[PDB]
């Protein structure tokens, strides 16, 4: 069923992806690299005292605080959903090998018995209504760019001035590039305007992953993570193999002279892709106005801030179903990209813009280094973008693509299994739009709160409620998938956007509360994804600009967890045992140093201003800006703090660009 073409780095097609500069050339050739992360300034993730600490703490917390999750996956009591062994990884050392990204997910979807298009006309109207409501009356805003982010293919620039020039040029030339693509002249669009080429595959660490302690043997077992070899990836699974990657860390002693304590493993590695910036800029210029619309007009379903903001909505429900989606990005359907594009054309969107958007979701992928002596291969031909990878992580609108798919998928699930009496309200496009507009504002007896693959489905009192309970039972039974679109199940320990829904004896949403996940505090404090990057002078460009600041927001973020105090005391006791120092004093010193350093970056902050004007969100984001890419948005952050992390292209340039894209 057609193998994807593959080109080695030596091939002209791969050489054309990398500009004639040191950074781009280094990116093309970069071999497999691994090493201990600098967890905190002067502390490596493999430091013997640190691993001793992690061993004692993970064992103690699991012992004293076993998971309190009922038969229906509802969290109660202590607010704990699993063991605490997830911290037991040699951070910076990945599992081997990482996966080769699947060039086509068509067979993957078909074999999982998932649909190759909307099943019914109702579903087709709902997906199309989502496009109409999300992309209609948009207002232009400046194009915001993350400081220190790469432009990837072909320049690999990290310079803000260069990135602004690239983005401004992209907005000027997007029309000419899109029109070339409409003529099938992809090579010309890429050669002239750097719009096309490929995604650059970077493998990111998932610092904590499931580990269990086998009571029979007293030995730890890491969760097997399936990976595709090159043959499997190019054939979409027709040939080659899907096998468990090796998380065994024994090798670190032999290779690096690192002592590996019992039950410590190599980290899970996830594919992540970096888009060609010239192609992403015109997409981002439309994506941000879309987010502003859905987070304002449809704030009920889409705008999530605090645990109390979520709680106010959920408390009004008679039933709350916390869903789980299996491997969302890889299963994301190309038919949805095509349906979205077709609908945007029907709405009157510039055909050249729609073509750029379509192309961004079919683009080839350049594989770097999944393992030693592997990689440096382009999958797919940039002259005719035709890949079906699912949803590329570095595409300019990935969050919206997952949100569009999932929001409709969950609504269809509620219609099919609980509310057939609402089907008569969805007869054509105008009625589909009116119904969806009402549903997304939380005005119907069936409701939802969602973001990409995370959601909580609700039922108020009414005709759909009884069906809601049967659907929940069907999910518990786990024999039948309730959706034709994606693999849906219930979450084992229901949570929404980091906050655990803590139920009491009644097991009803009315008396349930949202609390911070204590395991996430431990993940963030002891297993960060990145090192401190102490060599990167400009802190605003680091992956973790001000790690010390997270101490100041900790009580606000995690204080509501039933075992908050217990965990902090266990940390103090274990850190004393391992380092002969106070963890609290260590964090207070880091908080002081980072507070002082922060004022250098904030124009409004005097030489020793303090954190007085900053919110807990501001502090969590300054310690981890990745939270601004999956948890929160621009409007949730103070303006003076957003400026530390982002820079923008003027609204004058974007306003002119947006006028040319949008209908009449
Ligand atoms: Mg969830």
Phi, psi of 444 (to 5 degrees): -105, 165
Q: Which two tokens stand for residue 234?
A: 């190019």
Is 205 strand, coil or helix? strand
Pairing of β 199-206 and β 495-496: unpaired
Which residue in this structure is represented by tokens 């064992």? 59
> Do 75 and 493 form a contact (C-beta atoms < 8 A)?
yes
Q: Which of 518, 573, 525 is nearest to 67 (CA)?
A: 518
> Which residues carry a binding-site annotation for Mg(2+)?
453, 490, 494
Question: Distance from CA of residue 386 to its chain's centroid?
Answer: 24
Is 155 strand, coil or helix? coil
Distance 323 CA to ligand 1 centre (A): 6
Distance 589 CA to ligand 1 centre (A): 35
Residues contacting residue 52 through CB under 8 Å, at least 6 positions apart: 261, 577, 578
DSSP state of 34: -
Cis before residue 269, ω within 30 degrees of 0? no
Distance 570 CA to ligand 1 centre (A): 28
Distance 82 CA to ligand 1 centre (A): 15
Distance 434 CA to ligand 1 centre (A): 28
**The dihedral sign for the CA sequence 162, 166, 167, 168:** positive
Q: At what angle do helices 465-477 and 398-417 cross, to 10 degrees?
A: 110
Q: At what angle do helices 121-135 and 398-417 cross, to 10 degrees?
A: 140
Distance 495 CA to ligand 1 centre (A): 5
**What's the rounded Cα separation, in Å, for the pair 57 and 215?**
18
Q: How was this structure determined?
A: X-ray
Query: In DSSP terms, which residues pair with 246 in a beta bridge?
Result: 96
CB atoms within 10 A of CB 230: 17
> Do 230 and 240 form a contact (C-beta atoms < 8 A)?
yes
DSSP state of 275: -
> Which residues carry a binding-site annotation?
453, 490, 494
Question: Distance from CA of residue 525 to its chain's centroid?
Answer: 20
Q: Which of 375, 379, 304 is nearest to 2 (CA)?
A: 379
Residues contacting residue 377 through CB under 8 Å, at least 6 positions apart: 6, 7, 8, 9, 14, 230, 366, 367
> Do 285 and 223 form a contact (C-beta atoms < 8 A)?
no
Helix (H) or strand (E) holding 286: helix 277-296
Helix (H) or strand (E) holding 524: helix 518-526
How many degrees, rounded to 5, is the angle at CA 106 between CA 104 and CA 108? 90
Query: In DSSP terms, which residues pair with 268 in a beta bridge?
Result: 206
Is 430 strand, coil or helix? helix
Alpha-helical segments (H) within 6-142: 12-15, 22-29, 48-64, 106-111, 121-135
Buried b or exposed e, range 207-216, using 16+ CB within 10 angstroms = bbbebebeee
Q: Which of 202, 230, 151, 231 is nearest to 369 (CA)?
A: 202
> Do 107 and 390 form a contact (C-beta atoms < 8 A)?
no
DSSP state of 606: -
Pairing of β 495-496 and β 499-502: antiparallel
3-state helix, strand, coil in the chain (%, to 5): 45, 15, 40
Helix (H) or strand (E) holding 416: helix 398-417
CB atoms within 10 A of CB 585: 11
Residues contacting residue 430 through CB under 8 Å, at least 6 positions apart: none
Alpha-helical segments (H) within 137-200: 160-182, 186-193
Cis before residue 154, ω within 30 degrees of 0? yes
Which residue in this structure is represented by tokens 């949570």? 495
Distance 454 CA to ligand 1 centre (A): 5
Query: In DSSP terms, which residues pair with 320 in a beta bridge?
Result: 458
SS3 annotation, 474-498:
HHHHCCCCCCCCCCEEECCCCEECC
- Go through the domains of the chain in sequence order and give each one's CATH number: 1-30+102-276+333-397 (no CATH), 37-91+518-606 (1.10.490.60), 277-332+398-517 (3.30.70.1600), 607-664 (6.20.410.10)
Q: Which two tokens stand for residue 647?
A: 């820079």
> Do 247 and 95 form a contact (C-beta atoms < 8 A)?
yes
DSSP state of 387: -
């Amino acid at each position: 069923p057609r193998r994807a073409p593959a080109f080695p780095l030596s091939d002209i097609k791969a050489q054309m992806l990398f500009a004639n500069n040191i950074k781009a050339q280094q990116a093309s050739k970069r071999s497999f690299k691994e090493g201990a992360i600098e967890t905190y300034e002067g502390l490596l993730s493999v430091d013997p005292r640190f691993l001793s600490f992690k061993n004692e703490l993970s064992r103690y917390l699991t012992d004293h605080f076993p998971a309190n999750v009922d038969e229906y996956g509802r969290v109660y009591g202590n607010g704990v959903r699993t063991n605490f062994f997830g911290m037991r990884h040699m951070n910076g050392f990945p599992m081997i090998p990482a996966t080769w990204p699947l060039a086509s997910n068509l067979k993957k979807r078909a074999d999982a018995d998932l649909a190759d298009g909307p099943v019914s006309e109702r579903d087709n109207l709902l997906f199309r209504a989502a496009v109409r409501l999300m992309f209609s009356d948009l207002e232009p805003v400046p194009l915001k760019i993350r400081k220190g982010s790469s432009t990837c293919i072909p320049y690999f620039s990290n310079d803000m001035g260069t990135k602004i020039e690239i983005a401004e040029r992209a907005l000027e030339k997007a029309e000419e590039a899109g029109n070339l693509m409409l003529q099938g002249k992809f090579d010309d669009a890429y050669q002239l305007h750097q719009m096309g080429g490929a995604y650059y595959v970077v493998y990111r660490a998932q610092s904590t992953d499931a580990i269990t302690l086998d009571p029979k043997t007293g030995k730890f077992v890491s969760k097997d993570r399936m990976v595709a070899d090159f043959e499997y990836a190019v054939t979409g699974g027709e040939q080659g193999s899907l096998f468990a990657a090796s998380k065994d860390a024994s090798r670190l002693k032999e290779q690096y002279g690192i002592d590996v304590p019992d039950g410590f493993f190599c980290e899970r590695r996830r594919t992540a892709m970096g888009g060609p910036f010239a192609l992403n800029a015109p997409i981002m210029a439309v994506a941000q106005p879309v987010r502003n619309k859905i987070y304002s007009k449809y704030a009920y379903t889409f705008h999530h801030t605090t645990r109390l903001n979520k709680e106010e909505k959920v408390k009004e429900w008679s039933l709350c179903v916390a869903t789980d989606v299996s491997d969302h990005d890889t299963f994301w359907p190309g038919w949805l990209r095509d349906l979205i594009c077709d609908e945007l054309l029907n709405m009157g969107y510039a055909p050249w813009w729609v073509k750029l958007f379509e192309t961004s979701l079919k683009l080839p992928v350049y594989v770097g280094a999944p393992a030693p002596e592997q990689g440096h291969t382009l999958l797919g031909d940039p002259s005719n973008p035709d890949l079906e990878v699912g949803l590329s992580s570095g595409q300019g609108a990935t969050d919206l693509m997952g949100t569009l798919l999932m929001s409709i998928t969950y609504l269809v699930m509620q219609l099919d299994h609980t509310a057939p009496h609402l089907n008569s309200r969805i007869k054509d496009m105008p009625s589909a739009c009116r119904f969806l507009d009402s549903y997304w504002q939380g005005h119907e007896e069936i409701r939802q709160i969602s973001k990409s693959d995370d959601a909580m489905l609700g039922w108020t009192k009414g005709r759909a409620l009884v069906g809601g309970h049967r659907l929940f039972e069907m999910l518990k039974e786990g024999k039948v998938n309730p959706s034709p679109y994606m693999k849906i199940s219930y979450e084992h320990g229901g949570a929404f956007l980091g906050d655990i829904l803590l139920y009491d004896s009644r097991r009803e949403p009315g008396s349930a509360i949202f609390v911070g996940n204590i395991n996430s505090m431990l993940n963030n404090q002891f297993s960060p994804e990145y090192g401190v990057q102490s060599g990167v002078r400009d802190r605003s460009k680091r992956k973790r600009p001000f790690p010390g600041l997270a101490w100041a927001s900790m009580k606000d973020t995690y204080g509501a967890c039933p075992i908050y105090s217990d965990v902090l005391e266990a940390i103090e006791r274990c850190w004393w045992n391992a380092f002969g120092e106070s963890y609290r004093a260590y964090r207070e010193d880091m908080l002081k140093r980072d507070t002082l350093e922060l004022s250098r970056y904030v124009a409004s902050m005097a030489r020793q201003a303090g954190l007085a004007e900053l919110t807990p969100i501001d502090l969590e984001v300054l310690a981890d800006p990745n939270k601004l890419q999956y948890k929160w948005t621009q409007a949730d952050v103070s303006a003076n703090i957003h400026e530390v992390l982002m820079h923008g292209v003027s609204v004058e340039k974007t306003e002119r660009f947006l006028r040319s894209v949008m209908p009449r």
